Symmetry: C3
């Protein structure tokens, strides 16, 4: 298992591409995005990205970048969970997630 940070960005759907770009630009290996509702009849549609980042700082870079660009104007929460990636060709490389 390879430590990861699960960066979660829940924010407005309309930022999807904007945030995907940020995620792509961060060098995060990918991301998972889903449609969600959230409150912060009063549920609003939003999207949740989950970006497993190799490092915390990458996650924060993404968070910071998203937040600074968008979170004044757009609803969003970014949080981060410890994860370990057990498998993820892209995330762990040909190396595998048990790089001995």
């Amino acid at each position: 298992a390879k430590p990861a940070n699960k960066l979660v960005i829940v924010t407005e759907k309309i930022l999807l591409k904007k945030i995907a770009k940020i995620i792509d630009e961060s060098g995060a290996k990918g991301y998972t995005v889903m449609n969600t509702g959230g409150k912060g009849s009063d549920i609003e549609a939003n999207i949740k990205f989950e970006i497993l980042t190799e490092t915390r700082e990458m996650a924060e870079e993404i968070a910071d970048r998203v937040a600074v660009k968008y979170f004044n104007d757009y609803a969003g929460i970014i949080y981060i969970c410890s994860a370990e990636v057990l498998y993820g060709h892209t995330f762990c490389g040909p190396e595998g997630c048990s790089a001995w």
Copy 2:
């Protein structure tokens, strides 16, 4: 980053409003809900509520579980999270990137 508990409630879709009410009542600053399938495939919903404290999360969990989980399928679990950003979650205070 502000420590949080990601309270996850996966339960029957029909409880959405009912649980949202509980969440709203808990003083949780918001929640994220999504449609999911599950076996425990039935359509259900997953709430994710980031709570400032563990006890809030448990209050919600306890409240939901007591009010619904003896009659409705549902799992509640809780993950450590840190909120990096979340106006509503961290307040005007911010999520205090330095602790």
Copy 3:
């Protein structure tokens, strides 16, 4: 609260049943699956979340899925610490106690 591993498998939608079977076969008490998009532009995939009582059950599932599918199918499997607060099936009549 009962410690759990939230095994998350994000992979191609078409593996849903195949992975569900693996999950079911692992003796995981259940799983949550959702439709997701992902990049690794967005492709539709599924995220399973399996709360497993033990890490090794999660890894068993992960290993089984990854071995059986991840050479041919896109997917990431990762695992989070979780605690189950409630989950009849997950914690048994015993309750989530701890």
